[PDB]
Symmetry: none
Subunit: 242 residues, 2 copies
Amino acid sequence: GVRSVTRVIDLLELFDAAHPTRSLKELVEGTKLPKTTVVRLVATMCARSVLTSRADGSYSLGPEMLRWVRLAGRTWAPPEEVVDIMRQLSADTGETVNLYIRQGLSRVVVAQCESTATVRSVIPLGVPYPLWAGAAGKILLLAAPELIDDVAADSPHGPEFADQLREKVEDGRERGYQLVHGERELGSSGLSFPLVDSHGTVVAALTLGGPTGRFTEDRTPHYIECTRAAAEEISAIGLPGL
Amino acid sequence: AGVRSVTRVIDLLELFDAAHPTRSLKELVEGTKLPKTTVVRLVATMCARSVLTSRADGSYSLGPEMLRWVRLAGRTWAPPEEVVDIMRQLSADTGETVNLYIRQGLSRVVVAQCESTATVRSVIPLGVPYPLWAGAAGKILLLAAPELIDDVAADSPHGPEFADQLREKVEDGRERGYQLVHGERELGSSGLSFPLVDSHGTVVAALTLGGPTGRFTEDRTPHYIECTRAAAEEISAIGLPGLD
């Protein structure tokens, strides 16, 4: 896209829970950008309170940036009753529950209830992942038949994979869910059900993700019974901001 | 040039706020006075990156990208250091642990704390959700959320006549300006809570003393109330960015 805007966002994405502050050196090294470019961008963000210059010489997110993060948090937060349903589903299954939407050719988690299991899905909120792998992507594609060829072209299987991706999406339509093992990343499995608006359009994918050794055939019937009831309940409650 | 685009991106994001959570393209043009073709191009790059999301009603909200800093923001949130100073002095002045609570769903959560040096004191853990149906802080937080009282009441271990009771005590707090309760949370504990408000006067947090009932005596509570009232007023004057 627009280069300098790509770069500021690239820079901001370096700040996360594990890296709450960042030196000039770290921002340069993580952006691959030139120091003189990074120095100017950082000074601009500082001036506008998008970043804060700290006493140790490092930087952190500034008050303006935190204001937007809070606002987006409220924009995307499901109703409290929907969060309660997700929390009960995580407890009932012992798996992290992710509520994904599509943005372009990506899927992104916009609400999450982690389980207490020490090995579990902790896919980060707000980070784009591809549509071509995993259960949620193929559920979101039920509402985007026109994107299937572009998603296959985006996948490492390449354009010729479009027909089989189309088939898999349609299999999910008939079953009413996707249960997939080790497509995204070895050891990882996902079960996803569609969340629908009043028109029956699929607007989001309610998904359990976790270690494939807990998504075994003796356990998934229960996962399926609980997740289906939850997705039906959340669809009926409605997700106003979608 | 590169910096010009970045200022424009900031100028556009600045038009999103609590009162205007979504903006149409016309609003983004009017609010920035940028040429429409310039705004269209920047909004395109922003949507492609999920910084903004195009909605069906033609408007844009902040998009899911921004959620990727939610966990970081939560973990590093702290009150202004001048607010921590006031809480610390309140703890010294009363001899009690000072808790700053907010509501999260149907729960109260301590998000900042200044413990006293007393060997018997309140030592509630930070960031652990506790119920809203017992104690002074819970009834102060429910000042901003009367629509939640019934559900909070159903969450208690109490009988069906308790919704009404809770509703009445929350109201008594609104009239008096604080809550002072004994033995609700557990035997031997007491709590005094004052509202902390945003600029509008909405209750966003509850400044709270908790400790042994035997220190919340007739002789002591007037001074506890006088100190906590002043501190709350001072903290609300300073403001609580992140809560409001």
